Protein backbone atom coordinates (compact mmCIF):
# COMPACT_ATOMS: atom_id res chain seq x y z
CA UNK A 1 0.00 0.00 0.00
CA UNK A 2 3.05 2.31 0.15
CA UNK A 3 3.73 5.13 -2.29
CA UNK A 4 5.94 4.62 -5.35
CA UNK A 5 8.10 7.33 -6.90
CA UNK A 6 9.88 7.05 -10.26
CA UNK A 7 12.49 9.68 -11.15
CA UNK A 8 14.33 9.71 -14.50
CA UNK A 9 17.67 11.39 -15.14
CA UNK A 10 19.58 11.92 -18.38
CA UNK A 11 22.49 9.52 -17.85
CA UNK A 12 24.53 7.68 -15.21
CA UNK A 13 26.35 10.82 -14.05
CA UNK A 14 23.14 12.81 -13.56
CA UNK A 15 21.57 9.78 -11.80
CA UNK A 16 24.50 9.42 -9.39
CA UNK A 17 24.51 13.13 -8.57
CA UNK A 18 20.77 13.13 -7.93
CA UNK A 19 20.81 9.88 -5.91
CA UNK A 20 23.80 11.01 -3.82
CA UNK A 21 22.19 14.38 -3.11
CA UNK A 22 18.94 12.64 -2.16
CA UNK A 23 20.92 10.44 0.23
CA UNK A 24 22.73 13.43 1.80
CA UNK A 25 19.34 15.07 2.36
CA UNK A 26 17.80 11.89 3.77
CA UNK A 27 20.68 11.51 6.26
CA UNK A 28 20.52 15.19 7.29
CA UNK A 29 16.76 14.90 7.74
CA UNK A 30 16.97 11.80 9.92
CA UNK A 31 19.67 13.42 12.08
CA UNK A 32 17.57 16.60 12.41
CA UNK A 33 14.43 14.68 13.45
CA UNK A 34 15.86 11.78 15.55
CA UNK A 35 19.60 12.39 15.99
CA UNK A 36 20.22 9.11 14.22
CA UNK A 37 20.29 7.73 10.65
CA UNK A 38 20.31 4.02 9.84
CA UNK A 39 21.33 3.31 6.22
CA UNK A 40 21.72 0.01 4.36
CA UNK A 41 24.45 0.21 1.75
CA UNK A 42 24.77 -1.72 -1.44
CA UNK A 43 27.53 -2.68 -3.81
CA UNK A 44 27.75 -2.28 -7.57
CA UNK A 45 29.14 0.54 -9.67
CA UNK A 46 26.20 2.87 -9.23
CA UNK A 47 25.89 2.19 -5.50
CA UNK A 48 29.54 2.89 -4.85
CA UNK A 49 29.49 5.93 -7.14
CA UNK A 50 26.67 7.32 -4.97
CA UNK A 51 28.97 7.02 -1.91
CA UNK A 52 31.81 8.82 -3.67
CA UNK A 53 29.34 11.64 -4.31
CA UNK A 54 28.39 11.71 -0.65
CA UNK A 55 32.07 12.13 0.19
CA UNK A 56 32.20 15.12 -2.20
CA UNK A 57 29.09 16.91 -0.84
CA UNK A 58 28.47 15.80 2.76
CA UNK A 59 31.79 14.89 4.43
CA UNK A 60 30.80 17.34 7.23
CA UNK A 61 27.78 15.34 8.43
CA UNK A 62 27.87 14.14 12.03
CA UNK A 63 28.84 10.57 11.24
CA UNK A 64 28.74 9.59 14.87
CA UNK A 65 24.97 9.65 14.40
CA UNK A 66 25.04 7.54 11.19
CA UNK A 67 24.87 3.74 11.45
CA UNK A 68 25.57 1.63 8.41
CA UNK A 69 24.55 -1.92 7.51
CA UNK A 70 24.85 -3.90 4.23
CA UNK A 71 22.19 -5.52 2.12
CA UNK A 72 24.63 -8.19 0.93
CA UNK A 73 28.29 -8.96 0.69
CA UNK A 74 30.62 -11.45 -0.91
CA UNK A 75 32.11 -14.19 1.26
CA UNK A 76 35.74 -13.39 0.47
CA UNK A 77 38.60 -11.84 2.48
CA UNK A 78 38.08 -8.51 4.30
CA UNK A 79 40.23 -6.41 1.95
CA UNK A 80 39.42 -8.36 -1.22
CA UNK A 81 38.46 -6.07 -4.14
CA UNK A 82 35.13 -7.95 -4.39
CA UNK A 83 33.94 -6.87 -0.92
CA UNK A 84 31.09 -4.39 -0.82
CA UNK A 85 32.12 -3.15 2.63
CA UNK A 86 35.75 -2.51 1.62
CA UNK A 87 34.59 -0.67 -1.49
CA UNK A 88 32.39 1.61 0.67
CA UNK A 89 35.37 2.04 3.00
CA UNK A 90 37.57 3.24 0.15
CA UNK A 91 34.82 5.35 -1.46
CA UNK A 92 33.71 7.17 1.70
CA UNK A 93 34.22 5.82 5.20
CA UNK A 94 37.98 6.03 5.38
CA UNK A 95 37.79 9.73 4.38
CA UNK A 96 35.60 10.94 7.20
CA UNK A 97 35.53 10.71 10.99
CA UNK A 98 33.12 7.75 11.21
CA UNK A 99 33.38 5.69 14.39
CA UNK A 100 33.78 1.95 13.62
CA UNK A 101 31.34 1.08 16.40
CA UNK A 102 28.65 2.46 14.00
CA UNK A 103 29.77 0.33 11.05
CA UNK A 104 28.16 -3.11 10.73
CA UNK A 105 29.77 -5.08 7.95
CA UNK A 106 28.66 -8.58 7.16
CA UNK A 107 31.02 -11.48 7.94
CA UNK A 108 33.85 -12.12 5.50
CA UNK A 109 35.57 -15.41 4.63
CA UNK A 110 38.25 -14.80 7.30
CA UNK A 111 35.66 -14.32 10.08
CA UNK A 112 36.19 -17.89 11.44
CA UNK A 113 32.77 -19.19 10.36
CA UNK A 114 34.96 -20.96 7.79
CA UNK A 115 32.86 -22.98 5.37
CA UNK A 116 29.72 -22.53 7.54
CA UNK A 117 28.12 -19.72 5.58
CA UNK A 118 24.79 -20.33 7.28
CA UNK A 119 26.33 -19.69 10.71
CA UNK A 120 27.74 -16.43 9.34
CA UNK A 121 24.25 -15.39 8.21
CA UNK A 122 22.80 -16.26 11.67
CA UNK A 123 25.49 -14.07 13.18
CA UNK A 124 24.39 -11.11 11.06
CA UNK A 125 20.80 -11.78 12.07
CA UNK A 126 21.94 -11.60 15.69
CA UNK A 127 23.62 -8.29 14.92
CA UNK A 128 20.41 -6.90 13.39
CA UNK A 129 18.47 -7.86 16.52
CA UNK A 130 21.12 -6.40 18.88
CA UNK A 131 20.98 -3.09 16.96
CA UNK A 132 17.16 -2.96 16.85
CA UNK A 133 14.69 -1.39 19.23
CA UNK A 134 13.68 -3.49 22.24
CA UNK A 135 11.48 -6.39 21.21
CA UNK A 136 12.23 -5.92 17.47
CA UNK A 137 14.50 -8.15 15.42
CA UNK A 138 15.62 -5.58 12.85
CA UNK A 139 16.48 -1.86 12.84
CA UNK A 140 13.86 0.39 11.22
CA UNK A 141 16.26 1.30 8.44
CA UNK A 142 15.69 4.85 7.23
CA UNK A 143 16.89 4.03 3.69
CA UNK A 144 17.89 0.70 2.08
CA UNK A 145 19.87 1.38 -1.06
CA UNK A 146 19.69 -1.21 -3.85
CA UNK A 147 21.19 -1.94 -7.18
CA UNK A 148 19.42 -4.25 -9.56
CA UNK A 149 20.72 -6.73 -12.08
CA UNK A 150 19.38 -7.32 -15.57
CA UNK A 151 17.31 -10.24 -14.31
CA UNK A 152 15.94 -8.13 -11.45
CA UNK A 153 18.13 -9.50 -8.68
CA UNK A 154 18.66 -7.26 -5.64
CA UNK A 155 21.10 -7.77 -2.72
CA UNK A 156 22.03 -11.45 -3.44
CA UNK A 157 18.41 -12.51 -4.03
CA UNK A 158 18.21 -14.23 -7.44
CA UNK A 159 15.13 -15.52 -9.31
CA UNK A 160 13.76 -18.93 -8.24
CA UNK A 161 16.03 -19.27 -5.23
CA UNK A 162 15.44 -20.28 -1.64
CA UNK A 163 16.75 -16.86 -0.58
CA UNK A 164 14.09 -14.92 -2.52
CA UNK A 165 11.40 -17.38 -1.27
CA UNK A 166 12.34 -16.84 2.38
CA UNK A 167 9.48 -15.26 4.39
CA UNK A 168 10.79 -15.47 7.97
CA UNK A 169 14.62 -15.30 8.13
CA UNK A 170 16.12 -11.84 7.77
CA UNK A 171 19.60 -12.95 6.60
CA UNK A 172 20.58 -16.09 4.68
CA UNK A 173 23.62 -17.60 3.00
CA UNK A 174 23.72 -17.87 -0.78
CA UNK A 175 26.05 -20.65 -1.90
CA UNK A 176 25.33 -20.46 -5.65
CA UNK A 177 25.03 -16.93 -7.05
CA UNK A 178 25.13 -17.11 -10.88
CA UNK A 179 27.13 -13.83 -10.84
CA UNK A 180 30.65 -14.12 -9.44
CA UNK A 181 31.63 -14.84 -6.72
CA UNK A 182 29.16 -17.67 -5.91
CA UNK A 183 29.09 -17.26 -2.11
CA UNK A 184 27.30 -14.34 -0.48
CA UNK A 185 25.43 -13.32 2.66
CA UNK A 186 22.18 -11.45 1.98
CA UNK A 187 19.30 -9.64 3.59
CA UNK A 188 15.99 -11.25 2.48
CA UNK A 189 12.78 -9.58 1.25
CA UNK A 190 11.35 -9.44 4.78
CA UNK A 191 14.48 -7.55 5.93
CA UNK A 192 14.31 -5.12 2.98
CA UNK A 193 10.66 -4.58 3.86
CA UNK A 194 11.59 -3.38 7.39
CA UNK A 195 12.99 -0.22 5.77
CA UNK A 196 11.09 3.06 5.88
CA UNK A 197 12.26 3.72 2.31
CA UNK A 198 13.80 1.45 -0.31
CA UNK A 199 15.63 3.13 -3.19
CA UNK A 200 16.55 1.26 -6.32
CA UNK A 201 19.26 3.14 -8.26
CA UNK A 202 19.45 1.68 -11.77
CA UNK A 203 21.27 2.64 -14.97
CA UNK A 204 21.39 1.19 -18.48
CA UNK A 205 19.18 -0.34 -21.14
CA UNK A 206 20.19 -3.87 -20.05
CA UNK A 207 18.06 -3.33 -16.93
CA UNK A 208 15.02 -1.71 -18.59
CA UNK A 209 13.00 -4.95 -19.01
CA UNK A 210 13.51 -5.94 -15.39
CA UNK A 211 12.58 -2.46 -14.15
CA UNK A 212 9.35 -2.59 -16.18
CA UNK A 213 8.60 -6.14 -14.98
CA UNK A 214 9.06 -5.10 -11.36
CA UNK A 215 7.03 -1.87 -11.63
CA UNK A 216 4.41 -3.99 -13.52
CA UNK A 217 3.80 -6.39 -10.63
CA UNK A 218 5.89 -9.47 -11.36
CA UNK A 219 6.05 -12.17 -8.67
CA UNK A 220 9.23 -11.48 -6.64
CA UNK A 221 10.26 -15.11 -7.08
CA UNK A 222 10.41 -14.39 -10.85
CA UNK A 223 11.76 -10.80 -10.51
CA UNK A 224 13.24 -10.21 -7.01
CA UNK A 225 13.18 -6.40 -7.33
CA UNK A 226 9.35 -6.62 -7.25
CA UNK A 227 9.61 -7.49 -3.54
CA UNK A 228 11.86 -4.53 -2.68
CA UNK A 229 9.21 -2.32 -1.04
CA UNK A 230 9.57 0.31 1.72
CA UNK A 231 7.05 0.87 4.52
CA UNK A 232 6.63 4.57 3.64
CA UNK A 233 7.79 4.60 0.02
CA UNK A 234 9.68 2.83 -2.73
CA UNK A 235 11.78 5.05 -4.94
CA UNK A 236 13.09 4.12 -8.41
CA UNK A 237 15.95 6.38 -9.42
CA UNK A 238 16.59 5.62 -13.08
CA UNK A 239 18.45 6.98 -16.02
CA UNK A 240 16.50 7.29 -19.27
CA UNK A 241 18.05 4.05 -20.56
CA UNK A 242 16.92 2.02 -17.53
CA UNK A 243 13.49 3.68 -17.77
CA UNK A 244 13.11 3.04 -21.50
CA UNK A 245 10.39 0.38 -21.05
CA UNK A 246 8.30 2.57 -18.69
CA UNK A 247 5.82 5.30 -19.57
NA1 LIG B 1 25.23 8.97 17.85
NA1 LIG C 1 31.36 -3.40 13.41
Automatic annotation (TrEMBL):
Gene3D superfamilies: 3.40.50.1360. Keywords: Hydrolase. It comes from the Bacteria. Residues 11-236 form the Glucosamine/galactosamine-6-phosphate isomerase domain. Pathway: Carbohydrate degradation; pentose phosphate pathway; D-ribulose 5-phosphate from D-glucose 6-phosphate (oxidative stage): step 2/3. It is an enzyme of class 3 (hydrolase). Pfam families: Glucosamine_iso. GO terms for molecular function: 6-phosphogluconolactonase activity. One of its GO terms (biological process) is pentose-phosphate shunt. It catalyses: 6-phospho-D-glucono-1,5-lactone + H2O = 6-phospho-D-gluconate + H(+). Its EC number is 3.1.1.31. Hydrolysis of 6-phosphogluconolactone to 6-phosphogluconate. Belongs to the glucosamine/galactosamine-6-phosphate isomerase family. 6-phosphogluconolactonase subfamily. This is 6-phosphogluconolactonase.
